[PDB]
Enzyme design. Structure first.
Site, PDB file in Angstrom:
ATOM      1  N   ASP A  51       0.734  -1.147   0.110  1.00  0.00           N
ATOM      2  CA  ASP A  51      -0.046  -0.160   0.160  1.00  0.00           C
ATOM      3  C   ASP A  51       0.836   1.128  -0.190  1.00  0.00           C
ATOM      4  OD1 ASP A  51      -2.460   1.468  -0.130  1.00  0.00           O
ATOM      5  OD2 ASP A  51      -2.491   1.632   2.056  1.00  0.00           O
ATOM      6  N   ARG A  55       0.450   9.374   0.430  1.00  0.00           N
ATOM      7  CA  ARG A  55      -0.087   9.547   1.483  1.00  0.00           C
ATOM      8  C   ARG A  55       0.014   8.801   2.691  1.00  0.00           C
ATOM      9  NH1 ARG A  55      -3.007   6.861  -2.344  1.00  0.00           N
ATOM     10  NH2 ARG A  55      -3.628   4.770  -1.897  1.00  0.00           N
ATOM     11  N   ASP A  57       1.754   2.471   7.426  1.00  0.00           N
ATOM     12  CA  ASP A  57       0.393   1.932   6.848  1.00  0.00           C
ATOM     13  C   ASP A  57       0.745   0.762   5.886  1.00  0.00           C
ATOM     14  OD1 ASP A  57      -0.683   4.005   8.388  1.00  0.00           O
ATOM     15  OD2 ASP A  57      -2.192   4.426   6.703  1.00  0.00           O
TER      16      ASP A  57
HETATM   17  C1  LIG Z   1       1.092   6.539   9.343  1.00  0.00           C
HETATM   18  C2  LIG Z   1       0.311   7.613  10.554  1.00  0.00           C
HETATM   19  C3  LIG Z   1       1.154   7.524  11.844  1.00  0.00           C
HETATM   20  C4  LIG Z   1       0.595   8.498  12.761  1.00  0.00           C
HETATM   21  N1  LIG Z   1       1.547   9.706  13.088  1.00  0.00           N
HETATM   22  C5  LIG Z   1       1.111  10.985  12.675  1.00  0.00           C
HETATM   23  N2  LIG Z   1       1.677  11.938  13.272  1.00  0.00           N
HETATM   24  C6  LIG Z   1       0.959  13.377  12.999  1.00  0.00           C
HETATM   25  C7  LIG Z   1      -0.156  13.486  12.064  1.00  0.00           C
HETATM   26  C8  LIG Z   1      -0.753  14.640  11.806  1.00  0.00           C
HETATM   27  C9  LIG Z   1      -0.195  15.647  11.676  1.00  0.00           C
HETATM   28  C10 LIG Z   1      -0.508  16.872  11.345  1.00  0.00           C
HETATM   29  C11 LIG Z   1      -1.950  16.919  10.767  1.00  0.00           C
HETATM   30  C12 LIG Z   1      -2.676  15.826  11.142  1.00  0.00           C
HETATM   31  N3  LIG Z   1      -2.158  14.694  11.407  1.00  0.00           N
HETATM   32  C13 LIG Z   1      -0.612  12.036  11.444  1.00  0.00           C
HETATM   33  N4  LIG Z   1      -1.598  12.001  10.649  1.00  0.00           N
HETATM   34  C14 LIG Z   1      -2.183  10.601  10.066  1.00  0.00           C
HETATM   35  C15 LIG Z   1      -1.631  10.391   8.845  1.00  0.00           C
HETATM   36  C16 LIG Z   1      -2.154   9.103   8.281  1.00  0.00           C
HETATM   37  C17 LIG Z   1      -3.660   9.198   8.302  1.00  0.00           C
HETATM   38  O1  LIG Z   1      -4.322   7.890   7.715  1.00  0.00           O
HETATM   39  C18 LIG Z   1      -4.501   9.524   9.585  1.00  0.00           C
HETATM   40  C19 LIG Z   1      -3.894  10.837  10.246  1.00  0.00           C
HETATM   41  N5  LIG Z   1      -0.141  10.792  11.895  1.00  0.00           N
HETATM   42 MG   LIG Z   2      -3.043   6.043   5.282  1.00  0.00          MG
END
Ligand SMILES: CCCCNc1ncc(-c2ccccn2)c(N[C@H]2CC[C@H](O)CC2)n1
Ligand SMILES: [Mg+2]
Ligand SMILES: [Cl-]
Ligand SMILES: [Cl-]
Ligand SMILES: [Cl-]
Ligand SMILES: [Cl-]
Length: 243
Positions: free
Chosen positions: A127, A131, A145
């Site tokens: 995947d 994004r 992911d």
């Molecule tokens: C791959 C995700 C790991 C989690 N870490 C993280 N840290 C900050 C943000 C973050 C930073 C700035 C603004 C919003 N989220 C964030 N967003 C996610 C990214 C993937 C999506 O599917 C869900 C939210 N993840």
């Molecule tokens: Mg994702």
């Protein structure tokens, strides 16, 4: 079990984004040293250890009022967020400064370095896309992911590491275009026919010929004809030095 954490060291807050099996919440993890660490909680990875691969901080299994389990995976917080949304911000005021070509390559290299790690352990991402790549506070990228316009033609249902290379190819296109959707004009249901007739992603406007060749090699019909992540990483590293 060695990964589990006591929930009492965890505090949840706002929602950061929407995930597969649920929403992702910001939070504070109380570390062993007594300090507090900003983390991300989603509401096989612990064996991974690589700067360009997301680390797992632990897991929590909060019990509900009725007793139904609510598992939670603790991951690091990355204020710069997913790389896809970051590319879009950069081409706007208020958002990050215009990303140069060199920096864009550094993203590609980081991802390449990260996939090289997982591919050596014979682990498939399944995947990969802009994004699903996060920007650390040091502006380095890490993969996380582990949809039709990212899937390789042979998988349209077999999957190998060379399919990750296909997705990596698309991700390179996302980066070089600063957040465009793949295959403009083409619809999801047309993808197999479109690819089968030999058509691939077109070259971006200001993209380099030698940068397109690298990402084009990722979409060769035969998976075995495609380059490994080790070859791709060095090609991008060498293209970056020639600037
Ligand atoms: C791959 C995700 C790991 C989690 N870490 C993280 N840290 C900050 C943000 C973050 C930073 C700035 C603004 C919003 N989220 C964030 N967003 C996610 C990214 C993937 C999506 O599917 C869900 C939210 N993840
Ligand atoms: Mg994702
Ligand atoms: Cl809480
Ligand atoms: Cl990480
Ligand atoms: Cl940002
Ligand atoms: Cl295209």
């Amino acid at each position: 079990e060695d990964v589990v954490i006591d929930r009492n060291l965890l505090i949840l807050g706002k929602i950061l984004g929407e995930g597969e099996f649920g929403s992702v919440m910001e939070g504070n993890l109380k570390q062993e040293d007594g300090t507090s660490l900003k983390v991300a909680v989603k509401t096989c990875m612990k064996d991974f250890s690589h700067p360009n691969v997301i680390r797992l901080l632990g897991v929590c299994i909060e019990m509900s009022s009725q007793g139904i389990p609510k598992p939670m995976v603790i991951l690091p917080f990355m204020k710069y967020g997913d790389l896809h949304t970051y590319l879009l911000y950069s081409r706007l005021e208020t958002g990050p400064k215009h990303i140069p070509l060199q920096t864009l390559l550094k993203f590609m290299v980081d991802i390449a370095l990260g996939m090289e790690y997982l591919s050596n352990r014979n682990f498939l991402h399944r995947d990969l896309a802009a994004r699903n790549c996060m920007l650390r506070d040091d502006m380095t990228v890490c993969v996380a992911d582990f949809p039709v316009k990212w899937i390789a033609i042979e998988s349209l249902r077999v999957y190998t590491s060379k399919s990750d290379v296909w997705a990596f190819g698309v991700t390179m296109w996302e980066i070089a275009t600063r957040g465009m959707t793949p295959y403009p004009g083409v619809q999801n249901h047309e993808m197999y026919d479109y690819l089968l007739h030999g058509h691939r992603l077109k070259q971006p406007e200001d993209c380099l010929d030698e940068l397109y060749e690298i990402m084009y090699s990722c979409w060769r019909t035969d998976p075995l004809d495609r380059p490994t992540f080790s070859v791709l990483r060095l090609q991008l590293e060498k293209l970056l030095e020639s600037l």
